[PDB]
Structure formats: structure tokens, C-alpha cells
Amino acid sequence: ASLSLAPVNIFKAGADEERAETARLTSFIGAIAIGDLVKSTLGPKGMDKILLSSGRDASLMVTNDGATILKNIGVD
Amino acid sequence: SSSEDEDAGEGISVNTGPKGVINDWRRFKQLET
Ligand SMILES: Nc1ncnc2c1ncn2[C@@H]1O[C@H](COP(=O)(O)OP(=O)(O)O)[C@@H](O)[C@H]1O
């Protein structure tokens, strides 16, 4: 019996855990989403992204750099 | 007698929708601020 699916609860309010299928699915979805986002900017015919900041400054960036795209996103 | 007891795809990274809806977002945000 896992921590989450047990008659007694062992966690704080808001704390959870994902077991084999759920953890693997979450990891694969996140990684594949990141790769799909960063791709299409690859090779001589790759296109640029627009990074529209949601902060008070609302900075605007146009880039083809994968690292620049990946660092300026809020990923959970 | 009578007398008796009776008586999948979780990662979305929404792209342009926030840009389209920023008008209403700021409309509510000014009043909320
Ligand atoms: N003129 C070209 N002809 C063929 N392939 C190219 C050419 N220029 C770049 N590439 C290929 O594009 C790939 C990705 O480069 P790029 O799109 O600049 O992103 P990054 O270099 O950050 O991975 C490289 O592996 C390179 O082999």
C-alpha cells in the first residue's frame, strides 16, 4: 500500500506523491512538451519565438536560442 | 366483557490566449489592485 492510497493519511495539507505510472507519465509529458516547444527553432530553417513577459515590466524578447527560451518560462 | 383495558497533456504552456485576454485581465486587475 502506497502513502497516498492508504486508509491513514501521511502527508501535510497540500503535500502529495505520484507513484510509478503517474510519476513516469508526468516526467515523460514534461520532457516531451519541453522538447516539442524548443524544437522548430532547430536548423537553418528554424523560426524564432516571442517571449512575452507577464511581469510588471512586460519585457518582450524574440529569440531562436533554446536556452533563452527555456530559462524564461515558469515550468512546474 | 366490554369493560376491559379499553374502558494527458498537462503541460500546456498557453501561447497567445493570454495576449488576447490581457485586456479583460487588466480590466479586472486595476479594480482588484
Ligand atoms: N547550413 C547548414 N546546413 C545544414 N545543417 C546546419 C546548417 N547550419 C546549422 N545546421 C545544423 O543545425 C543544428 C542545430 O543548430 P541551431 O538550429 O543553431 O541550434 P543549436 O545550434 O542551438 O542546436 C546543428 O546541429 C547543425 O548541424
Swiss-Prot record, chain A:
ATP binds at residue 43. The modification Phosphoserine is found at residues 2, 59. It comes from the Eukaryota. The modification N6-acetyllysine is found at residue 12. The modification N-acetylalanine is found at residue 1. It is found in: Cytoplasm. Signal peptide: none annotated. ADP binds at residue 43. Component of the chaperonin-containing T-complex (TRiC), a molecular chaperone complex that assists the folding of actin, tubulin and other proteins upon ATP hydrolysis. The TRiC complex mediates the folding of WRAP53/TCAB1, thereby regulating telomere maintenance. As part of the TRiC complex may play a role in the assembly of BBSome, a complex involved in ciliogenesis regulating transports vesicles to the cilia. Component of the chaperonin-containing T-complex (TRiC), a hexadecamer composed of two identical back-to-back stacked rings enclosing a protein folding chamber. Each ring is made up of eight different subunits: TCP1/CCT1, CCT2, CCT3, CCT4, CCT5, CCT6A/CCT6, CCT7, CCT8. Interacts with PACRG. Interacts with FLCN. Interacts with DLEC1. Interacts with SVEP1. Belongs to the TCP-1 chaperonin family. This is T-complex protein 1 subunit beta. It comes from Homo sapiens (Human). The gene is CCT2. The chain holds residues 2 to 77 of 535 of the full protein.
Curated annotation (Swiss-Prot), chain B:
Forms a complex with the beta and gamma subunits of the GTP-binding protein, transducin. Interacts with the CCT chaperonin complex. The lineage of its organism: Eukaryota, Metazoa, Chordata, Craniata, Vertebrata. The modification Phosphoserine is found at residue 3. Acts as a positive regulator of hedgehog signaling and regulates ciliary function. Disulfide bonds: none annotated. Transmembrane segments: none annotated. Belongs to the phosducin family. This is Phosducin-like protein. It comes from Homo sapiens. It is found in: Cell projection, Cilium. The chain holds residues 18 to 74 of 301 of the full protein.
